[PDB]
């Protein structure tokens, strides 16, 4: 907030401030947001398929026929595709201590701390998908099961629940990203006044 250093150092620190945010805030969140988005976008593709996976067989209530295997197969391909996909860092490693930090800063439910090797990373939490598969596994024989209305709805409730858990974390990401912009903005705002005070402060010193 003053060091009575050249305007050269001030304009330099300012420029540096933009680089910091861009890499630690924007990029950091543009990845987590993109990563999660891509995944949920793959899950939404499953939902579209889910519609053609349900049919009647009452007779009738209407008892619902569900292609358990078909849904299980799709669901286990999604978790696979994003099983180890990381949210942070985008393309590097970190200390399990700093990895646990980031996770506790954007919630904790959204991602899961893990180690690849060379360090640690905060990967996507595949719990929602797991609970989904556990629910389907509990359904019964494969790869086609028929459940009365009460049973179907009860299941759909659980299923739908999981969906929203991801739908939520998805929106949250957008938050943690906008927050990064805030902190970065707060930075440049005071950094600027700093440079100027140095300038006016500097001028008095120059003036002295």
Numbering used by the authors: 125 to 332
Paper text:
As wild-type TCs can exist as either homo- or heteropentamers and in order to obtain a map of the functionally relevant heteromeric tip, we used the TC map from the ΔipaB strain to remove images that contained IpaD homopentameric tips from the wild-type data set. Therefore, the one from the data set showing the lower cross-correlation should comprise primarily heteropentameric TCs. This map resolved to 24 Å resolution and also displayed a pentameric tip structure and clear helical pattern in the needle portion (left). However, the highest subunit within the wild-type map is morphologically distinct from the others and from the equivalent one in the ΔipaB map (left, thin arrows). As we have shown that IpaB (62 kDa) is found within wild-type TCs and requires IpaD (37 kDa) to localise there, we assumed that this larger subunit corresponded to IpaB. We therefore docked the cryoEM map of the needle with the lowest MxiH at the needle tip, from protofilament P1, lying right below this subunit. After subtraction of the needle density, four IpaD subunits can be docked into positions β to ε of the TC, showing that the volume occupied by the subunit in position α is larger (thin arrows). We then docked into this portion five copies of a crystal structure of IpaD that lacks its first 38 and last 10 amino acids, from which amino acids up to 125 were further removed (i.e. an IpaD fragment containing aa 126 to 322). Finally residues 323–332 were hand-built into an α-helix at the extreme C-terminus, as this region is strongly predicted to participate in IpaD's coiled coil and was not resolved in the crystal structure. However, the subunits are much further apart in the new model, allowing for the presence of both a cavity and a perpetual pore within the TC.
Gram-negative bacteria use type III secretion systems (T3SSs) as protein transport devices for injecting virulence effector proteins into eukaryotic cells during infection. T3SSs consist of a ‘needle complex’ composed of a basal body commencing in the bacterial cytoplasm and spanning both prokaryotic membranes, into which a hollow extracellular needle is embedded that serves as secretion channel. The tip complex (TC; Mueller et al., 2005; 2008) tops the distal end of the needle. In Shigella, it is composed of two proteins, each essential to host cell sensing: IpaD and IpaB.
